[PDB]
Design a protein around this ligand. Structure first.
Ligand SMILES: OC[C@H]1O[C@](O)(CO)[C@@H](O)[C@@H]1O
Ligand code: NA
Lengths: 277, 271
């Protein structure tokens, strides 16, 4: 039998929803008659690398790595050092670019922020995710680029560092309100923080969306059911997983590495978003 | 280093988020590698998953079964010297190899806490009826009523599917037929239910009190904040990983620990 190996970091948040990604990977492997193995990549570059080798030494025939910590170059070196088909999710490779399936998180963020600016929002708050996360880093970069491209000055008092948890959302908002710098819209780097933030705003008697419009990322199942319904950036996780797993199985059947279908999210517009007052 | 193998069918890869995070974290705090295999869609495939991991030289196995029966699981246990344990299922012979929560009892106790606070007409939204947890929560609800001794009304009960959309749909159904509290089988459903109540302009908790099960991270941040039954998932994972490694470390098996849920009262509930 052929086995597909998955390596995924033990982080509380994942930019590509983990149970969703695992579900579609498992389903795809099952339908194509492959066994699936997932190894804990744990929580550092070194352990992500060791988990890849571990799976090979279990005779996995192909590997999908979803790494938080390994640098692009480290990933390219891994791919080159091995004969088995190895592909990377959520990171864009420099040398082995056909081995990546990636979503331009920076662009998605730029797009959500640009939408706020074109709806009339000049003073936009931003809640970051953890600073060790590529996805968090890209979203923040897309926020700063959207401001700078629209001739809006960057003010770090409008950026609150968060940790992907609802609590960090509520606390990030309380911190921004105490800072006193005015804002008409808030972009949270995931839905959990956006929900925490809507709570703290409601508690402080700040109307959403009337006084502050809110956007998250992830488009979680509860987003249409928050009060008010949460506008959110949807990532094509399912598509992305079917691509990388489908390609890895293609390789095992004699396929070759063809150029990348790249991906982008879409902002889903719900009641938490409107023009300023 | 030693490896702990985890067999979980993909039909459960939708609580699962928690288990994976916590099993991995707890394996790393103890210096072990976690490896997971997919139990797929049959007793034979779950069995084969376990054997697969063993033949890859995992040192101990945890399974979260869907298809394999306990008779079947007890026999797998007897046929292997490697520690093999089961999460969320009660074993008959090797009960010490089991980590399980009495979902029917904690459901009972939560609904009872509603009765004692003054509720008499209590609505109930089920999870998917192929899930034992779903069965047991319904069961615990019907027991608390019958025993209080409020008489079961099948009009106060709707079928859900564990999703927020199904919670809203369930409430929509219920509204086209009188209750002061609503019990949702998970938070996700509770949240969709509160959305449908708000949409209809039914006041929560003033008109309808709402509780869920799971106590998810977002619960305190909903509007109103969601009252929920906290299951000790983290503690149960710590227990199963801890016990396996105890076996590996040379220790031995022990009578199973009892885990109970607890109702956390928030703004979405009153007496
Ligand atoms: O989808 C979430 C629900 O599904 C299950 O994983 C299987 O019954 C439950 O443990 C959980 O409450
Ligand atoms: Na994280």
């Amino acid at each position: 039998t052929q086995t597909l190996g998955l390596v995924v970091t033990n982080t509380l948040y994942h930019g590509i929803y983990f149970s969703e990604l695992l579900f579609h990977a498992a389903r795809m492997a099952e339908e194509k008659g492959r066994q699936l193995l997932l190894a804990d990549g744990k929580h550092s570059a070194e352990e992500e690398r060791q988990a890849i080798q571990y799976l090979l030494d279990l005779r996995c025939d192909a590997i999908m790595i979803y790494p938080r910590f390994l640098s692009v170059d480290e990933i390219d070196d891994i791919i080159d050092a091995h004969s088995q088909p190895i592909m990377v999710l959520n990171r864009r490779l420099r040398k082995n670019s056909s081995h990546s399936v990636w979503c331009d998180h920076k662009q998605t963020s730029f797009n959500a922020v640009a939408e706020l600016i074109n709806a009339g929002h000049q003073e936009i708050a931003f809640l970051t995710g953890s600073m060790d996360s590529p996805t968090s880093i890209e979203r923040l970069a897309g926020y700063k680029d959207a401001l700078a491209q629209h001739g809006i000055a960057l003010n770090e008092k409008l950026i609150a560092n968060g940790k992907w948890t609802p609590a960090s959302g509520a606390e990030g908002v309380e911190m921004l309100l105490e800072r006193g710098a005015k804002f008409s819209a808030l972009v949270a780097s995931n839905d959990d923080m956006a929900i925490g933030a809507m709570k703290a705003l409601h508690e402080r008697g700040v109307a959403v969306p009337e006084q502050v419009s809110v956007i998250g990322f992830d488009d979680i199942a509860i987003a249409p059911y928050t009060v008010p319904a949460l506008s959110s950036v949807k990532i094509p996780v399912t598509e992305m997983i079917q691509e990388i797993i489908g390609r890895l199985i293609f390789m095992l059947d004699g396929g070759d590495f063809s150029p990348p279908k790249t991906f982008s999210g879409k902002l889903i517009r719900r009641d938490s978003l409107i023009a300023p007052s």
